[PDB]
């Protein structure tokens, strides 16, 4: 037998939950399939527990300042287990909330692993039972990438961000491999909490896809905080030693000769080199659903797959791997399908990003280089500043704030904002609304400053 629904959602993570909830508001008869824990990567091994750990790291960094601010010196060893237990409890509270959200919406929860069948009419099977709908959303997310043994023997001795959230103790010595935001965030947390930490990157700077100013500044701030940034460096092999691991590294700096270095006594080797979509076991071939060579589901601007009645959103499609993106694309899809809003879709331009470095980074819109390519060098003007936030007026430890505004054409439309500094995590959202509305430099000029803040600097550039 086959049970029929209006909407079947494969994956109860960010995008799948949001899409199902909105569809149900519109009257859809919906079900969500989930093999593991509701909330997906973000709630269980992603955004949420990362932010708890970031808050813990931030707290610790600020307490280096406690004597400078007039208090007796707060000399203590962090106890990883204290926070791990509390973090885990918060994730459990959230799992229970998301289950209840589906129940309140009368969305059926199908527990298990879905795969498509060969029925010409798109149908899935879960635990030997079949389900069909005229609309099936694939929202299965991804997973961390790990090197192949054939390429890096011993790579399996490292962990990923998934394993980071299983750690029960602070590693004494950590080596994080990668240069993107996950690598940066993990390295910064581990180092702030007291691990002797290295960050191994293929080139000279982290975050090379971000604006050059952010890439530069973030690299400098990492080093100033005590993270050893191992530049032009790659892992060749990993071996188990009596103490932890030995990492064999090759370093090849331009203008120098290549050199092999052993890194001994590593407790935590964390691969943060990419994400792979969760599609291998879906039986996509049974319906001819199109993927790229990496396994991402191919979609159009409306989240359609190449197969009528089948859609995909979120990390499984490989574009803008963020929770709010999955959510927004999933909601827009629900209005298209169940409110018949044929133009309902997510605009993937001007999505804002925060990176929870120390201090945090915020960005929205085009890098200076992207703007130059799009508009022409003669038609781009940038404004920027660098300062030490007044928080540090009384401290011996310092962090900087850098800000860049990228403007296009005669009217100086603000096409990008890029910053790193205290408060930038909470500062960005409102500026992203302005950018999405097409604000010009004059619109920023026209807004009275709030003093004393860091944020006022973005409305007083000249």
Ligand X SMILES: Cc1cc2nc3c(=O)[nH]c(=O)nc-3n(C[C@H](O)[C@H](O)[C@H](O)COP(=O)(O)OP(=O)(O)OC[C@H]3O[C@@H](n4cnc5c(N)ncnc54)[C@H](O)[C@@H]3O)c2cc1C
Does residue 179 have a known ligand-binding role? yes
Does residue 241 have a known ligand-binding role? no
Tokens of 202: 């293929």
Please give the Cα distance from 384 to 434 (Å, whole number).
Answer: 18
CB atoms within 10 A of CB 112: 12
Interacting partner of 182 out of a copy of itself, ligand X, none (Cβ under 5 to 8 A depending on kind): ligand X
Taking the least distance from each CB to ligand X, the nearer of 146 and 384 is 146
Helices 80-104, 47-63: inter-axial angle, 10-degree rounding: 150
Please give the Cα distance from 142 to 291 (Å, whole number).
Answer: 14
Interacting partner of 433 out of a copy of itself, ligand X, none (Cβ under 5 to 8 A depending on kind): a copy of itself
Give the chain's count of helices (H) and strands (E). 11, 23
Interacting partner of 230 out of a copy of itself, ligand X, none (Cβ under 5 to 8 A depending on kind): none
Minimum separation from the CB atom of position 401 to a copy of itself (A): 11
Interacting partner of 41 out of ligand X, a copy of itself, none (Cβ under 5 to 8 A depending on kind): ligand X
Taking the least distance from each CB to ligand X, the nearer of 165 and 431 is 165
Does residue 185 have a known ligand-binding role? yes
Minimum separation from the CB atom of position 290 to ligand X (A): 18
Q: What does DSSP assign to residue 281?
A: T
Tokens of 406: 């990228």
CA angle 193, 197, 200 (to 5 degrees): 140
Minimum separation from the CB atom of position 277 to ligand X (A): 9
Name the nearest CA neighbour of 127 among 115, 109, 136, 119: 115
Does residue 206 have a known ligand-binding role? no
Interacting partner of 243 out of a copy of itself, ligand X, none (Cβ under 5 to 8 A depending on kind): none
Minimum separation from the CB atom of position 122 to ligand X (A): 14
Does residue 114 have a known ligand-binding role? yes
Taking the least distance from each CB to a copy of itself, the nearer of 241 and 453 is 453
Residues that bind ligand X (CB under 6 A): 10-16, 33-36, 40-42, 45-47, 50, 113-114, 139-141, 161, 182, 278, 282, 314-316, 321-324, 326, 451-452
Minimum separation from the CB atom of position 433 to a copy of itself (A): 4
Does residue 354 have a known ligand-binding role? yes
Name the nearest CA neighbour of 103 among 30, 211, 159, 39: 30
Please give the Cα distance from 195 to 177 (Å, whole number).
Answer: 15
DSSP sequence for 330-344: HHHHHHHHHS--TT-
Interacting partner of 315 out of ligand X, a copy of itself, none (Cβ under 5 to 8 A depending on kind): ligand X
Minimum separation from the CB atom of position 166 to a copy of itself (A): 17
Ranges assigned E (strand) in 123-277: 123-126, 129-132, 136-138, 142-144, 173-177, 196-200, 228-230, 233-240, 245-251, 259-266, 268-271, 275-277
CA angle 203, 206, 207 (to 5 degrees): 120
CB atoms within 10 A of CB 191: 23
Does residue 16 have a known ligand-binding role? no
Q: Is 451 a catalytic residue?
A: yes
**What is the set of active-site residues?**
451
For the annotated binding site for glutathione, the residues are 14, 21, 98, 331
Q: Could you tell me which residues are annotated as the binding site?
A: 14-15, 21, 34, 41-42, 50, 98, 114, 179, 182, 185, 202, 208, 274, 315, 321, 323, 331, 354, 451
Known binding-site residues for FAD equal: 14-15, 34, 41-42, 50, 114, 315, 323, 451
């Amino acid at each position: 037998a086959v049970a029929s629904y209006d909407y079947l959602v494969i994956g109860g993570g960010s995008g799948g939950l949001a899409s199902a909830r909105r569809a149900a508001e519109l009257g859809a008869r919906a079900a969500v399939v989930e093999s593991h824990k509701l909330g997906g990567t973000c709630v269980n091994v992603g955004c949420v527990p990362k932010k708890v750990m970031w808050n813990t790291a931030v707290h610790s960094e600020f307490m280096h300042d406690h004597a400078d601010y007039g208090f007796p010196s707060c000399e203590g060893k962090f106890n990883w287990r204290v926070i791990k237990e509390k973090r885990d409890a918060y994730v459990s509270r959230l799992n229970a909330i998301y289950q209840n959200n589906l129940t309140k919406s009368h969305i059926e929860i199908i527990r298990g692993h879905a795969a498509f069948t060969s029925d010409p009419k798109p149908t899935i099977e879960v635990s030997g039972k079949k389900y069909t709908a005229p609309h099936i959303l694939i929202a299965t997310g991804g997973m961390p990438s790990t090197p192949h043994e054939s390429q890096i023997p011993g790579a399996s001795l490292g962990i990923t961000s998934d394993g980071f959230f299983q750690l029960e103790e602070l590693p004494g010595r950590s080596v994080i491999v990668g240069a993107g935001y996950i690598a940066v965030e993990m390295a910064g947390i581990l180092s702030a909490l007291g691990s002797k930490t290295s960050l191994m990157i293929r080139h000279d700077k982290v975050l090379r896809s971000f604006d050059s100013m952010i890439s530069t500044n973030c690299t400098e701030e990492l080093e100033n905080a005590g993270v050893e940034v191992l530049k032009f460096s790659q892992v060749k092999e990993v071996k188990k030693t009596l103490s932890g691991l030995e990492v064999s590294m090759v370093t090849a700096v331009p203008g120098r000769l290549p050199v092999m270095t052993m890194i001994p006594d590593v407790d935590c080797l964390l691969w943060a080199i990419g994400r792979v979509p969760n599609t291998k076991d879906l039986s996509l071939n049974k319906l001819g659903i199109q993927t790229d060579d990496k396994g991402h589901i191919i979609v159009d601007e409306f989240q359609n797959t190449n197969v009528k009645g089948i859609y995909a959103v979120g990390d499984v499609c490989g574009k803008a791997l963020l929770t709010p993106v999955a959510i927004a694309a999933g909601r827009k899809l629900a209005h298209r399908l169940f409110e018949y809003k044929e133009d309902s879709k997510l605009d993937y331009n001007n999505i804002p990003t925060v990176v929870f470095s120390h201090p945090p980074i915020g960005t929205v819109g085009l890098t200076e280089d992207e703007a130059i390519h799009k508009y022409g060098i003669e038609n781009v003007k940038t404004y920027s500043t660098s300062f030490t936030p007044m928080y540090h007026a009384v401290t011996k430890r310092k962090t900087k704030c850098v800000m860049k505004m990228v403007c296009a054409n005669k009217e100086e439309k603000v096409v990008g904002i890029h910053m790193q500094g205290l408060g930038c995590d909470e500062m960005l959202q409102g500026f992203a609304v302005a950018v999405k509305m097409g604000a010009t430099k004059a619109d920023f000029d026209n807004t009275v400053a709030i003093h004393p803040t860091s944020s006022e600097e973005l409305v007083t550039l000249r």
